[PDB]
DNA sequence: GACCCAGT
DNA sequence: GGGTTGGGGGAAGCACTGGGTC
């Protein structure tokens, strides 16, 4: 429903944000800056970060892998499954489903309805407007500073070499005009302890954002334009989507890295309406913080259910014990 | 004179300033962004009151009202207690917007952004009563995401403070129209979005190093009689 | 006191106008001028009459189309030709407007005309911009003639560049100084000995230019310039122009600091100067994956870098001198 | 500073006048870091001294020359008190970044 | 069908992952910097890692071996049977059948339907622009954290100089120009409790990216390209290609190294849908961690089936009590 | 503190030359041991090889070698007990048998 | 929206 | 301990959607 994830993870030896290889031989990994403060003042260090975009990108991966195992797997477009995320154009009226159907853009309520994918990360539309405000944002991953407080230095990034061994037409290999594919490249992996966040707004999954509430009965109630138990079967399609981001489907090079994935401590809010972030997982105060948080939006009126993950989080909070992710969207799909 | 004050910790930045390849921000985050990210607070928290047939109308209604409760075109200013650092960021910007060029036209931009670990952002008013004082409360938090859809901003507190005509120097931003009293640093900044003007307002940014790196340090301009006390670092906020 | 107004675009565009002011002034004298930074802004405070802002110019210029016209619709092979310009239509639209001012700053005439600022200059601009919905067409950053004259000139003589082409392909590095407290006659003009003409090397041998953050310690290095910025404070800015397979793009834009190399330099090339270009120079052309590990080092003073380049260039070739070692534990201590 | 007459033996084992060729001492005294693998990694460059002595006289330069003990002490009282990582390996990686000169001694 | 087998290994005495080039003497092993705990903050420490590369090219070898055996063997590239991994590189455009037939670059469905090598381990197409996702993805193998914790990296290389005996037909081995290609070169080889967590998701074999449905009477099925007892003989060789893993062929330099290895715990979990990745073996309190990932996962719906060994688990779930990897597969062969 | 010295002073002469005495083995075992009871046999086999050097020395001309002082025997017994763990027991392993390899003048 | 271009 | 060899050559990013004009 209203579901903010955060916490630390310790990932290392991957390669995650390269830079292409159209040219350039050495694919030297993404290097970033983070501000420490220590001896009372602030130095900075060559340290790797990791977009974001590699985060959405396999949210959307994710979302429909779950989404093909439910019988409504019709509502979806056929740039989604060949992971495109293009999300029509400036001039593309018509939609490419599974099935070949054809939708009109004219408002989001005959848009989220027929199609799934484009409510969830939104879409745009310039010729006729009618911008749909992506529901699921990601974070970057960046390396706490507490990791460089204890490290402040090292080379962190492990480059290694890689080659594509070739064959000719008997076995000979060739320098520049035997038509050989020989390559000798090198590929850098980042290490360190980095940070997650990750926010799911699924109350506005088949509601407008326009028309939020029906309001024709002195009642304000939820604008579902679309059916409730397919709603509800899109609700777990992106819940269980952020559950390959915790055993390793993060990034890119899955096929040769794979990064040695495992989070060692985490808190989540679980709740019915919109509720703030509690923090990135980067400062050291990140903990006793979100200690304060919880007691600034209790005393608000929010019925937010807090879920602690290889953290003590203090005895006065009602925080659940969670040993993984798992049971986390299990005690969250039923409400 | 009450002026709402809240922490944002967010590590790195979401804005982008108007450019191509490269996509450059600004130092301190702009007052357009700001209001568009308090203005969509109120639509999924106070649906009974923005209803609107599409999003153009949507954001615009928001912001027509921010402005009318507020005391003059100057939106919005923030305070950075941290050294700004000038990270380096390579996105994916697909260019398929013209009336050509297929459907998957997608190439890598360096969108880079900027990291700091501690900023502050003072809203101003003119006395509002108590019954939205508590709605404009409630809303100043549950800014999860500001920007862009790719990085996200957690507040930490909010709190009305008075001026008191407290010692203290400048700290967050000001426009550069009549302030030449007060090293000065001025860029376009951008206060007033547009949905189909430019002012130049004083960032408090300066570049000192003592032997290795060179950040970005404060400036200290001189003085100025309105100023507003926090966890014991006062910082001084210019009021027109 | 005159204070010329510098008119505020581009954090990296303002910068290259406004500090090609003074090669300028400096033609035409202006004594006791100073330069006061804004970040963008970059204001000059010089006490000098506008006349002699125009006479510096036509100097500026007539040096311009002397090293054009010498080379070579007509395209030439220099900096603001087609050294750095990776646009083959601004090989000769570019030209074409520094000599159109012969026709209008020679009998002091203002200028009327407004031309098209290419990316070289200025990496933020574009084709497809965004306003409010969808792209536009052509450039909407359109930029007058008195302010794009003022950018090439500073171009080509203070900012240096970097050109690795092999065939096809290219790669241009762009590296600019940019004062942040204060700055002077002797930095700014001393900044302009760092301009590598020509920076055409090709062949396959010198593939050590690959990367950018590599080939500004190869530029650095045969350019013992001024050493000012132990005392003082700069910072670098550093751009690229990727044409990988007649494809023109920009796909590295990092932001560093300039003064730490600056200072690691200094203390390398301190207690010998025969072996440690040799030895620099050869764990550059034969470890070229190696001399990574030591230019990262550099920017944050880390231990691994500093053995990890030599462990990966000994195993090829190095001279590996003794005096020069000392210079490192210099700075370790 | 007792590290000019100690990284000339070091340097014994990296230089080409002396073709034996062992980087791995360099690259366990280079990657030392808590308090035990730098005493050790020490130790196997200086256990070969023969190699030295002999192939400097197997060309006719005259033998290296070992370093003295006056000074070898200087290491272990002082990786004592500098137990922490954080100036340790501020010494450590020095002790190695010596072992790669040349000291043409052998023409 | 989606598998995830994830586990330890004793894998020791190995010069895996080497970096040295012709003109590079010492070649020595890949290290990789690893985060750990040793009763104090997260430090870093130096460790001898092998890359996720090896074991995808290691896998295409198991992978090409095990379906030559195949009647559908004939479906393959001949490059392939080279124990090539160059999957349509640069300087062709196209690749050759193992019968000496040719593949034609238009369609991404007719490349693996005649092809079995792009259809279980992805290629690439340079000129004509199309591109398919990696089927079988390979973590990298890194020892367990107790392990380096205990011993507090202790050097964990030992650096062995070899040389050859290329003495001239006179039987006299004299200068360098005298023409005696013979010297000294050294190998660096490792041990440790190293983990690995290889995933496989044979769901997607047969399946074009472009159209991956077809949806003809608007009903759920994927569209397959090749004959449906072609992908279940496919889906058995590559869920075979996992018995050389274990089986001593995790890399290179077999015929001078050949690591030893021993079945170690191993957890492999596989239910024939979206499943995700098990938790890596490279943090020694992982064990518990597997008591938590599909302790709940089973009461979602799914039908995992769970296979272990040498580890006792909560006791709680039908794990089922494997003996090696190949009774493994055997028993994920049988219900395909 | 002090006894490492006048140990590593006995250890230096067997391995150093105008001795014909060439035994590594031991001084390679003590260094790089793995358990506390090696390290104490060690030093045993490297100290029995006295009588045999404390002779020979002078009936080829070089001084005589100076036998470690008893007391540091004792200082060597009463640093290993109260120290068992392996973390910091490789440090005072190597630390003596690093001073086998020095430039003491044993025959002038 | 169809045109443009380079040298060892 | 007393001599012979220290890399050897080959590879060390192709294609791929270029971004400006007019």
């Known amino acids: 429903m209203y579901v903010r994830i955060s916490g630390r993870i310790r990932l290392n030896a991957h390669s995650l944000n390269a830079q292409g290889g159209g040219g350039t031989n050495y694919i030297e990994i993404t290097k970033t800056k983070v501000t420490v403060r220590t001896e009372n003042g602030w130095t900075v260090v060559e340290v790797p970060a990791i977009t974001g975009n590699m985060l959405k990108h396999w949210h959307f991966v994710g979302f429909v892998d779950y989404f093909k195992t439910t019988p409504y797997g019709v509502n979806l477009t056929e740039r989604a499954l060949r992971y495109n995320g293009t999300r029509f154009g400036q001039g593309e009226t018509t939609a490419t489903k599974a099935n070949g159907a054809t939708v009109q853009l004219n408002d989001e309520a005959t848009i989220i309805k027929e199609l799934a994918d484009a409510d969830v990360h939104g879409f745009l539309a310039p010729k006729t407007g009618r911008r749909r405000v992506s529901l699921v944002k990601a974070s970057f991953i960046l390396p706490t500073e507490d990791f460089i407080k204890e490290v402040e230095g090292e080379r962190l990034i492990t480059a290694i070499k890689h080659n594509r061994v070739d064959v000719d037409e008997k076995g000979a290999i060739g320098s520049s005009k035997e038509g050989t594919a020989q390559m000798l490249f090198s590929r850098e992996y980042a290490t360190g302890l980095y940070g997650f966040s990750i926010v799911l707004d699924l109350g506005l999954v088949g509601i407008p954002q326009g028309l939020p509430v029906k309001f024709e009965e002195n009642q304000p109630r939820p604008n579902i334009v679309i059916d409730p138990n397919e709603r509800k079967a899109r609700i777990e399609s992106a819940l269980k989507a952020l559950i390959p981001m915790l055993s390793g489907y993060i990034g890119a090079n899955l096929a040769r890295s794979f990064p040695v994935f495992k989070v060692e401590e985490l808190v989540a809010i679980a709740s019915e309406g919109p509720i703030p972030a509690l923090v990135h997982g980067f400062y050291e105060d990140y903990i006793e913080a979100n200690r304060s948080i919880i007691k600034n939006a209790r005393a608000l009126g929010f019925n937010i259910e807090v879920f602690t993950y290889n953290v003590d989080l203090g005895e006065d909070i009602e925080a659940t014990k969670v040993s993984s992710v798992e049971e986390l969207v299990a005690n969250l799909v039923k409400m | 004179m009450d002026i709402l004050l809240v922490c944002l910790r967010f590590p790195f930045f979401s804005v982008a300033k108007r450019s191509y390849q490269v996509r450059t921000s600004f130092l301190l985050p702009p007052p357009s962004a700001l209001k568009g990210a308090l203005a969509k607070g109120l639509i999924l928290l106070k649906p009974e009151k923005y209803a609107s047939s599409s999003l153009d109308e949507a954001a615009l209604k928001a912001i027509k009202e921010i402005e009318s409760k507020l005391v003059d075109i100057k939106a919005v200013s923030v305070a950075p207690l941290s050294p700004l650092i000038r990270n380096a960021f390579l996105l994916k910007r697909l260019r398929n917007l013209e009336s050509g060029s297929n459907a998957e036209k997608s190439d890598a931009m360096r969108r880079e952004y900027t990291f700091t670990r501690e900023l502050l952002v003072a809203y101003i008013f003119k006395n509002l009563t108590q019954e939205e004082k508590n709605l404009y409360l409630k809303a100043a938090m549950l800014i999860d995401v500001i920007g862009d859809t790719e990085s996200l901003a957690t507040p930490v507190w909010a709190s009305f403070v008075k001026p008191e005509d407290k010692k203290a120097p400048l700290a967050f931003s000001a426009p550069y129209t009549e302030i030449y009293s007060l090293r000065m640093y001025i860029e376009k900044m951008r206060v007033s979005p547009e949905y189909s003007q430019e002012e130049i307002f004083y960032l408090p940014i300066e570049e000192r190093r003592y032997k290795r790196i060179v950040y970005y340090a404060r400036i200290y301009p001189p003085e100025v009689e309105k100023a507003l006390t926090v966890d014991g670092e006062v910082l001084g906020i210019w009021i027109p | 006191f005159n204070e010329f107004k510098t008119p505020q675009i581009d954090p990296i565009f303002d910068l290259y106008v406004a500090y090609g002011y003074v090669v300028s002034l400096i033609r035409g004298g202006a004594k006791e001028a100073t330069l006061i930074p804004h970040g963008a802004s970059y204001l000059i405070q010089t006490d000098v009459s506008n006349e002699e802002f125009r006479h510096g110019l036509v100097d500026a210029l007539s040096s311009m189309l002397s090293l054009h016209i010498a080379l070579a619709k007509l395209v030439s092979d220099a900096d603001f030709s087609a050294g750095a310009n990776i646009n083959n239509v601004y090989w000769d639209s570019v030209p074409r407007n520094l000599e159109k001012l012969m026709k209008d700053l020679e009998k002091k005439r203002s200028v009327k005309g407004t031309a098209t600022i290419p990316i070289t200059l200025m990496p933020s601009a574009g084709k497809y911009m965004l306003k409010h919905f969808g792209v536009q067409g052509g450039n909407p950053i359109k930029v007058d003639l008195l302010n794009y004259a003022l950018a090439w000139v500073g171009f080509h003589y203070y900012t240096p560049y970097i050109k690795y082409a092999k065939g096809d392909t290219t790669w241009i590095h762009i590296y600019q100084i940019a004062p942040v407290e204060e700055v002077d006659m002797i930095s700014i003009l001393s900044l302009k000995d760092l301009k590598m003409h020509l920076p055409h090397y090709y062949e396959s041998n010198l593939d050590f230019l690959i990367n950018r953050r590599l080939a500004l310690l190869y530029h650095l290095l045969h350019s013992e310039a001024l050493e000012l910025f132990t005392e003082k404070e700069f910072v670098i800015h550093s751009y690229t122009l990727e044409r990988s397979g007649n494809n023109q793009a920009i796909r590295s834009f990092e932001e560093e600091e300039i003064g730490k190399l600056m200072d690691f330099l200094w203390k390398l090339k301190r207690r010998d100067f025969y072996h440690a270009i040799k030895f620099i120079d050869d764990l550059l052309k034969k470890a070229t994956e190696g001399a990574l590990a030591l230019i990262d080092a550099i920017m944050n003073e880390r231990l691994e870098g500093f053995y990890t380049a030599l462990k990966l260039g000994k195993k090829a070739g190095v001279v590996s001198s003794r005096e020069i070692v000392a210079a490192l534990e210099d700075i370790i201590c | ?107």
């Open chain 4, 1 to 107: 500073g007792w590290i000019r007459n100690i990284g000339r033996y070091l340097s014994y084992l990296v230089d080409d006048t002396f073709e034996e060729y062992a980087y791995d001492v360099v690259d366990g005294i280079a990657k030392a870091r808590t308090q035990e693998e730098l005493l050790e990694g020490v130790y196997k460059a200086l256990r070969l001294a023969p190699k030295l002595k002999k192939k400097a006289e197997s060309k006719g330069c005259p033998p290296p020359r070992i370093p003295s003990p006056e000074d070898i002490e200087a290491l272990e009282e002082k990786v004592e008190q500098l137990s922490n990582p954080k100036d340790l390996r501020k010494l450590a990686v020095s002790l190695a970044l010596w072992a790669f000169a040349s000291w043409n001694n052998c023409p």
